[PDB]
Design a protein around this ligand. Sequence first.
Ligand SMILES: Nc1ncnc2c1ncn2[C@@H]1O[C@H](COP(=O)(O)OP(=O)(O)O)[C@@H](O)[C@H]1O
Ligand SMILES: Nc1ncnc2c1ncn2[C@@H]1O[C@H](COP(=O)(O)OP(=O)(O)O)[C@@H](O)[C@H]1O
Ligand SMILES: Nc1ncnc2c1ncn2[C@@H]1O[C@H](COP(=O)(O)OP(=O)(O)O)[C@@H](O)[C@H]1O
Lengths: 505, 500, 500
Amino acid sequence: GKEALRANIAAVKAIEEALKSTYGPRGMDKMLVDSLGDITITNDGATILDKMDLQHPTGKLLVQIAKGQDEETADGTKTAVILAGELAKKAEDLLYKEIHPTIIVSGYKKAEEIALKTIQEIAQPVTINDTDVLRKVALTSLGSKAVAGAREYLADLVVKAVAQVAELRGDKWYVDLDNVQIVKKHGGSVNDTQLVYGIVVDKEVVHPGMPKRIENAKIALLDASVEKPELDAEIRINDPTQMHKFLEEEENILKEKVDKIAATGANVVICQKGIDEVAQHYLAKKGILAVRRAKKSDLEKLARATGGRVISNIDELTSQDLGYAALVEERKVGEDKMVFVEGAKNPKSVSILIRGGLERVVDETERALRDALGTVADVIRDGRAVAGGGAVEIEIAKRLRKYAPQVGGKEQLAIEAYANAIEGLIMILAENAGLDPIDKLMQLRSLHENETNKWYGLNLFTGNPEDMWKLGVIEPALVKMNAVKAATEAVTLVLRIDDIVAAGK
Amino acid sequence: GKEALRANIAAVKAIEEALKSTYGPRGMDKMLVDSLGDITITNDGATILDKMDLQHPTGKLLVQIAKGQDEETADGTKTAVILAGELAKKAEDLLYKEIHPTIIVSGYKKAEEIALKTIQEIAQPVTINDTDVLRKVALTSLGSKAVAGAREYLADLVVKAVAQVAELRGDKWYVDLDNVQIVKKHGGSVNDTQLVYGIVVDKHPGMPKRIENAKIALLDASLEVEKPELDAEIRINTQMHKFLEEEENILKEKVDKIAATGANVVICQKGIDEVAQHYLAKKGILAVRAKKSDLEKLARATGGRVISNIDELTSQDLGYAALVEERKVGEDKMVFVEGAKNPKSVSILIRGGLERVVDETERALRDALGTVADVIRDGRAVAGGGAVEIEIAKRLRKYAPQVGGKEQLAIEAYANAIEGLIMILAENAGLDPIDKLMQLRSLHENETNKWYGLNLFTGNPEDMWKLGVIEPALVKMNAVKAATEAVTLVLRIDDIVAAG
Amino acid sequence: GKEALRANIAAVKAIEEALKSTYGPRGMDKMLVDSLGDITITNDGATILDKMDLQHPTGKLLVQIAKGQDEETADGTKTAVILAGELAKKAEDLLYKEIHPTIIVSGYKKAEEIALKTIQEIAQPVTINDTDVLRKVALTSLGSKAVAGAREYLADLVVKAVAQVAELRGDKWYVDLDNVQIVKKHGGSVNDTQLVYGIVVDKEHPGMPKRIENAKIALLDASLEVEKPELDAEIRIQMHKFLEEEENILKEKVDKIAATGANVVICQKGIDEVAQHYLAKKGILAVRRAKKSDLEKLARATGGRVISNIDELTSQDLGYAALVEERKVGEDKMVFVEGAKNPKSVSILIRGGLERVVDETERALRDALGTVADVIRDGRAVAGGGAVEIEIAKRLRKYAPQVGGKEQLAIEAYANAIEGLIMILAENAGLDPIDKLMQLRSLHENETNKWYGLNLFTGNPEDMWKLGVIEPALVKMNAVKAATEAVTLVLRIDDIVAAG
Ligand SMILES: Nc1ncnc2c1ncn2[C@@H]1O[C@H](COP(=O)(O)OP(=O)(O)O)[C@@H](O)[C@H]1O
Ligand SMILES: Nc1ncnc2c1ncn2[C@@H]1O[C@H](COP(=O)(O)OP(=O)(O)O)[C@@H](O)[C@H]1O
Ligand SMILES: Nc1ncnc2c1ncn2[C@@H]1O[C@H](COP(=O)(O)OP(=O)(O)O)[C@@H](O)[C@H]1O
């Protein structure tokens, strides 16, 4: 049974070894070449674990635990898995001393609970009012990613965008990120990006003859597409003057189809099907704006943000169901055109237009932005925040070291190992920064003899212990707290296994 | 993760090694034999990277970065990729000293920013007025290419041609190269080439071949008949005989509509029906059998609009010209739309004895146009021939001490990597690289002699500016940015994982 | 001819690699097991190169150059050979750039001359008066060795001892270390050691006076044994009287010497046991075989002459002393000739608990004597700990630009090779070499902080001069000359041809 655990532990350390390079802001990236041939370079753990497949089932479960977090932000996964790795690494050293795993687990459980407690007790509170901090958080979150052009601009836009959707529910701050629309274009600098308080539709209008500007536009959201009379009736013809009139009836059918909708009268209509090129002219004749196939995602985000309902059947329409907007417009941002539904009736209306010079590079800003949104939303929803840069881990360590003596012997060693495994993560951080890990970590914890200097962490640039909070190195209290729970979960779920009997074939 | 970086760096140095031969005016060429069998010899990096395919993805991204320069000219790509190569070469030596890559990147970033600053501060300003300089620039740009016959003539024509399109937009000089038409013929010397201030079209004997004050009708419709086959299979039962004439009357009805306004020249991008020829020739109208490119360039340059549908015609929207003519330049004939209404109207007729050789002048000319356009749009220019790099080097060497230690070494390496490029230049010239570079930088103890660079012919350090060795300040500046970009984007990778 | 140079350079780097561990105060030691079986641990380069034999002739010449330093102290040899190593290491990198060796040599020559100049210009003057500094120097010199017990005591005794022998010759301070006597005993602490201003004889009849006042010393370099009549005459057995004649011969031998009447006699031969009683009968002190070394040191220090023949004696030749005594220092007894007539009279008694350990203090003391003597004779001293090398480096880096190109690179390489030595120092101290060196040179932007060097204990750049880290200006200066000598004498060789 020891070889099986050795195998599983090896499996974990393999992942830790894979990701260890990418940890920290001054980390390393990994390239991934699609079978198609498309190249994708990244350090974001979610994408790495995604594209990098594993055959070892414990690996699949491990990734399932680390990656499969409840939260929208992929931030904290790397931290969790690396920690799991370190825990397993020390665990091995505990096993070498002839300690039955259940003991190690029990010690790790105490250690995790107290880690959480230690995070709780130190976690400085933060209010949505203290906007600058939220900007610092956004900065820290998005800064770590490959793109570093105009971080301040983006972070600013992030905080401003997030603060808009937030609402008081039972005096508790609730936020729904589905309320934020996110659209992408190719070409253009990073500065050319802009937020919109209305709903943006990434499309070109169906006809040049339509009004491209409507004031106080009401929006009709129709999820309907011709009729086929072949199976209904064999279209037999032997007399040529007959069919000619048979034709016009079928156009009159379409007219009958559209007239119903023309009766109530819409200002703008959007459907998720290829628009027939005759309806264009008839809709253009009335002075109505239309759009070609937009995806259901934007339609559903349009639905709640406009104060209307999306309608499956075009015959069941009611005059209340249709959304209401203040301004609709179309414009050229960069080279291509886009549609903009500005000043929607719903107060929690937000959109963001993103742009990158290269089509593959703009995708990084997406993955960098999503986390920058979520991470801040998680600061808002929680109401606590903590200075990263190693200011946390060492406190957990010193805590567990001070607590370990008075837990009884065999757990104590597991707890101490836990503390060392927590500490070693900062060393991993420093390794990636090119500095001496030991020297710096010891320097750090040696500076924590004073409780005032609790926020002191390593700056990977100066290479010197400095106050992380003042330097704008803040992170969410929760996202870093969950990493410990997922990591402990994983390691315990590795040490809890004795053998595998998987069914091949 | 070290082996992956070694592989990528190797991948870069492979490209550097491929191109290193072709760098500089006195460089080497590379032959490329098409699968068809056609042979193509060239040194132009774009074509080399084009025809030479790479399987290594980092290579594809590398070429994507180097080629993927914002500007119209392929000039500067070689410079960039070679520099990237040198940077990687020194980087290796930095890694051998146990320096984590992020440090190297940080140092290279500082080095790049300061390189740009150093280019900015020294870059002599240049105005469109100082035409001779622009000629010297054109010369330097086009001279490096395989063809060296009548460089002065061409450069002159280039500068004259470019200066015509330039316009003041918000007191800032804007230029659009789409305004320049470029047509090619086979056979004839290099001197027989000429520019035209009107629009040249590279294309019935009974039509008037000369029209005064011609109005040009731009018809993007098939002048061919309409096909009643799919419409109606016609069964023969003297009836069909008239069925014929109706169908000619259709064409007459088609043309008469267009004959309403009364235009003197018509052009369409479809095979012209041989009955419309006689009817159009009967009126005394000139016609032609042409690509949409020239039509779109004709559109804006004549003061008219290209017409999609022949039924929607208006009496405005046909272009206006002063003179139209046709002539034999060399063996074949060409059409010339001279004295267009739009002021920014330009065309150029190019000719080479051999059909494959005239294509080189094209690739040599495009860059010679862009390069000068980039001098105009920017408003700065710098003497090449190594006068730049050594200053960057000395700058970074003087700046490196006061940046902190571990960055300082990366910066110094950067400076050495910048310097080594001139050595590469000298290697291709057959001279001793070290001796000459050191000779150069040793002459820069005096700032007056800042423009001193190597002459590849005399082999002696001389003032490059006075010898007409000038280049655009921007195109050489972008190379550093793309090169740094690439190298950093190589050192930023730790491992690759392909799917399936 | 390239492979021969590669081999020789390899040969040098091998030695550098051998010694690199032992460099600096916080260095490493090396154990050496004699063929006899006796073990000897040491870091002192002289002993390492001694006991470690090399077959490669260039190695023998190399050690011959490094060891073969003009000066009394073995200090500076390691520094020299390591520097030679670094120079060769960079030289390799210069050769890789296709630079003919003579160029490298020329550059290294300029670099060496300017290194010497740079040492001259910065070298703070020091006078014999500023005794505390001399103590700091002694400390620095002796401190690096294995023994660290009671360094202050020893250094103090060193300075006091050396200052006594120094004499004004043409107003220039001359010192002769042959004037200092050095004797050793086994067992006893390091504190139990003491200096004596008279001449100490390390030796043991009980009937003789062991204390004489104002003793005149007779230096007899003749066998006090009988003369052998065996070869002269095989005697057949009267004999009883034949005996007494032969005692009367000894009496006749001694009486002659008893003429002047000296109080102490010393000879370097086993003393006949009959002369003992006759000499003891007069009330004279004698000693058993002492070595000629102490006799020659006794000769000049007592104001007398050593006598080859006992028949040529004169009443003036004999030395004069104020006090003679014998005493038990530790377990064994020793003879002490105190208050000699010659003013430059010095002796030192050294003692270690272990017989092998006391030998280290010897080798540590000799250098501590010489090193200070070299500060006195020169009149200059310099703060070690890296405060020197970085200045040489910055100097050569600032000077290199204006020497012409191909030399400039050799000079820069020299500077880097000088710098790298401190890194080697820091490596042995367990700290990061690069970081610390860069930290050092970055602190030298201010000239005031010129003496800043690395402290191997705090790990921080600090003023070496104030911390008592001073060394002789000359001994460190000669190392550069011997190192350059060696490296140039390696790069000057193209091939070797032996007689097989
Ligand atoms: N500006 C910063 N300065 C110092 N440390 C930072 C900074 N930003 C982030 N970190 C550190 O980076 C660690 C991990 O960040 P990163 O690897 O980019 O994402 P993740 O949190 O998913 O691992 C955190 O533990 C945090 O302490
Ligand atoms: N007449 C010249 N004298 C010296 N150097 C020149 C001259 N013309 C061009 N060069 C050098 O050639 C280099 C590159 O030119 P070339 O290889 O022909 O095209 P590209 O600009 O794409 O590299 C420039 O960096 C410039 O320094
Ligand atoms: N106390 C000290 N602090 C710092 N450096 C020292 C000290 N003592 C000696 N050194 C350094 O040690 C180096 C070599 O000294 P050492 O090994 O003792 O003898 P040697 O000169 O024969 O190698 C010198 O370059 C000097 O700078």
